[PDB]
Design an enzyme around this catalytic site. Sequence first.
Site, mmCIF file in Angstrom:
data_model
loop_
_atom_site.group_PDB
_atom_site.id
_atom_site.type_symbol
_atom_site.label_atom_id
_atom_site.label_comp_id
_atom_site.label_asym_id
_atom_site.label_seq_id
_atom_site.Cartn_x
_atom_site.Cartn_y
_atom_site.Cartn_z
ATOM 1 N N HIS A 103 0.756 -1.279 -0.027
ATOM 2 C CA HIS A 103 -0.006 -0.037 0.015
ATOM 3 C C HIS A 103 1.026 1.148 -0.048
ATOM 4 O O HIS A 103 0.497 2.428 -0.504
ATOM 5 C CB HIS A 103 -1.014 0.060 1.188
ATOM 6 C CG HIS A 103 -0.329 -0.081 2.642
ATOM 7 N ND1 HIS A 103 -0.067 1.059 3.150
ATOM 8 C CD2 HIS A 103 -0.059 -1.088 3.235
ATOM 9 C CE1 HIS A 103 0.431 0.792 4.284
ATOM 10 N NE2 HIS A 103 0.680 -0.467 4.461
ATOM 11 N N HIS B 34 7.845 7.449 5.977
ATOM 12 C CA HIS B 34 6.913 7.092 4.793
ATOM 13 C C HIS B 34 5.959 8.339 4.218
ATOM 14 O O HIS B 34 6.155 9.412 4.754
ATOM 15 C CB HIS B 34 6.013 5.802 4.890
ATOM 16 C CG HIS B 34 5.051 6.140 6.134
ATOM 17 N ND1 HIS B 34 5.252 5.691 7.329
ATOM 18 C CD2 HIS B 34 3.749 6.619 6.068
ATOM 19 C CE1 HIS B 34 4.123 6.175 8.027
ATOM 20 N NE2 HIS B 34 3.155 6.750 7.258
ATOM 21 N N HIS C 3 2.377 9.662 2.258
ATOM 22 C CA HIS C 3 0.912 9.327 1.649
ATOM 23 C C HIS C 3 0.893 10.389 0.244
ATOM 24 O O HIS C 3 1.516 11.544 0.422
ATOM 25 C CB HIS C 3 -0.046 9.541 2.661
ATOM 26 C CG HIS C 3 0.028 8.699 3.901
ATOM 27 N ND1 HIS C 3 -0.622 7.534 4.058
ATOM 28 C CD2 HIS C 3 0.832 8.852 4.928
ATOM 29 C CE1 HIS C 3 -0.502 7.121 5.316
ATOM 30 N NE2 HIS C 3 0.701 7.703 5.757
ATOM 31 N N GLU D 87 -2.857 13.849 3.859
ATOM 32 C CA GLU D 87 -3.854 13.091 4.873
ATOM 33 C C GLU D 87 -4.521 14.375 5.691
ATOM 34 O O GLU D 87 -5.748 14.494 5.598
ATOM 35 C CB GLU D 87 -3.343 12.192 5.612
ATOM 36 C CG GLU D 87 -3.235 10.818 4.909
ATOM 37 C CD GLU D 87 -2.975 9.683 5.700
ATOM 38 O OE1 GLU D 87 -3.692 8.621 5.165
ATOM 39 O OE2 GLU D 87 -2.025 9.602 6.475
ATOM 40 N N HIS E 189 5.519 11.463 6.382
ATOM 41 C CA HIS E 189 5.290 11.068 8.216
ATOM 42 C C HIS E 189 6.559 10.652 8.693
ATOM 43 O O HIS E 189 7.260 9.598 8.069
ATOM 44 C CB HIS E 189 4.415 9.852 8.196
ATOM 45 C CG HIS E 189 3.008 10.370 8.125
ATOM 46 N ND1 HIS E 189 1.863 9.363 7.995
ATOM 47 C CD2 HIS E 189 2.271 11.581 8.097
ATOM 48 C CE1 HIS E 189 0.714 10.068 7.709
ATOM 49 N NE2 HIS E 189 0.973 11.542 7.801
ATOM 50 N N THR F 286 -3.327 6.330 10.637
ATOM 51 C CA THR F 286 -4.209 6.750 9.505
ATOM 52 C C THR F 286 -4.563 5.658 8.753
ATOM 53 O O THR F 286 -5.381 5.509 7.856
ATOM 54 C CB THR F 286 -3.903 7.823 8.701
ATOM 55 O OG1 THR F 286 -2.675 7.503 8.009
ATOM 56 C CG2 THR F 286 -3.369 9.166 9.721
HETATM 57 ZN ZN ZN Z 1 1.394 7.716 7.637
#
Ligand code: ZN
Length: 256
Positions: free
Chosen positions: A60, A90, A92, A102, A115, A195
Amino acid sequence: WGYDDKNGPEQWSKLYPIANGNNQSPVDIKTSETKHDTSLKPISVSYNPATAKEIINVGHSFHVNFEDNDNRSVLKGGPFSDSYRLFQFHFHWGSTNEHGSEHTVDGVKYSAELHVAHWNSAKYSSLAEAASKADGLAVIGVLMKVGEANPKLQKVLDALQAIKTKGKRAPFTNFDPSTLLPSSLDFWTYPGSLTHPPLYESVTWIICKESISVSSEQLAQFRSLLSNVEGDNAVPMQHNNRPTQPLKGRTVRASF
Ligand SMILES: [Zn+2]
């Protein structure tokens, strides 16, 4: 679970009922409702580039993991008395440039979010223990605004060609992720969660007010990571961002 229709954010509560909890992330930071907290210390990061370890395609997303056996790489200050130990960073991102982050600020969506995650090694003995504790995780969130190519993203993006498909991993060393952070460390903080599953309400969020840049082509490199295993039909990792969640009465505090 995933980010598909049948297994994505909207489905997540069927197996993880904490999805509908009171300390879920991410959130919309409304700046007119934030409260300046004058006891907030500045964020202090000191990371040792020798703790960088490995980059992994997790289907993912991708993770850059750090050796976490000692206090070579640490976060301090802000709202914490405890020292927190770096373990991973990482990103998003979204389908299009238009969403992707996010956290949102006064309803504005950015294009990606970084993050940088840490665990409470003053109080706990391992990440596995820390991960489910209310004061267990500390995550710096940096909003990524589409614009100029970011040269600091460089080594990371160049590493992705070795981890194209799910489960692939490779060494990723001699890297200090404080080089990806914005020049100002002014921040919002609030109590929240991971999250994605398992969605533990274990995270104290440190959201930077200042964005960092990312080019539209840099974002394509993320989305060209594949979520399938080598040999299977190619499935781009198009998005991995969760919708913002109800504050449910929490307060967002500001350092500034
Ligand atoms: Zn994250």
